[PDB]
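Ticket #4471: structure export looks truncated?
Reporter: QA, pipeline team
Priority: medium

Steps to reproduce: submit the single chain below to the structure queue and open the exported record.
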Amino acid sequence: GLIYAVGGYDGNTHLNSVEAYDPERNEWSLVAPLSTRRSGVGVAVLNGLIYAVGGYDGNTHLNSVEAYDPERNEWSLVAPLSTRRSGVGVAVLNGLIYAVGGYDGNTHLNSVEAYDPERNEWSLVAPLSTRRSGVGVAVLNGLIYAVGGYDGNTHLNSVEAYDPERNEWSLVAPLSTRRSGVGVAVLNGLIYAVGGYDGNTHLNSVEAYDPERNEWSLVAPLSTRRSGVGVAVLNGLIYAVGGYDGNTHLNSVEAYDPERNEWSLVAPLSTRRSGVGVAVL
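Actual output as written to the record:
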């Protein structure tokens, strides 16, 4: 019932701070910070813990992973990734947390690893066709979608879908707009790709993917252009948290209602941040 904004970069500092949003009161409050500063951090929720995966602390690309227990307001280090990953996409499916792509400081990655909390171990699974950081990762109907990113030479529109039962990725319809630093979330059978950077424009446009038709459609744009934006869904609204408009790191937050095809600003974060991970618990 709360949205957590985890880490990021405010333009001067790599952040360890963590803010929690109560939608019923429209307020953010600061909770226990991460132990390690992390921008470009991926976050996901499994069995009552929020996992913060990878990122960059301003001098080290991280393979470390910490887990937050809200009842104790405490982050604990868990098993590290096998590969250091900033700009990593992270999502949960069927009891595993997947860490998709990223950047290890020297190369954009196509590798993907999965964390099993029953084992406290990460294991490599099948790699992506195209290496990518700043990739959005969404889960819909038993498939993981890796959306956009940056391969080190090109801002990507390609979209790959992972079937865990066959351990295989396949390319589906690409985004209409290339998007690195894109936020993604799933609501009522559509995947929304929110904002990002296409290599020359910080985007306020938003597109939605229907898997049945293998088609992306443009929907209402954000009121503010946002790359490095954190995105998550709660109670029928998609929240776009923070980001960077090309000139300033943002503390504003907007919510998309599919019943209205409209975005509306809600309460802003205490600290501006891009490269922020957003989780719902």
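Status: closed, not a bug. The export was complete when the record was re-opened. Leaving a note from the reviewer for reference: Residues 51 and 67 are 4 Å apart (CA to CA).
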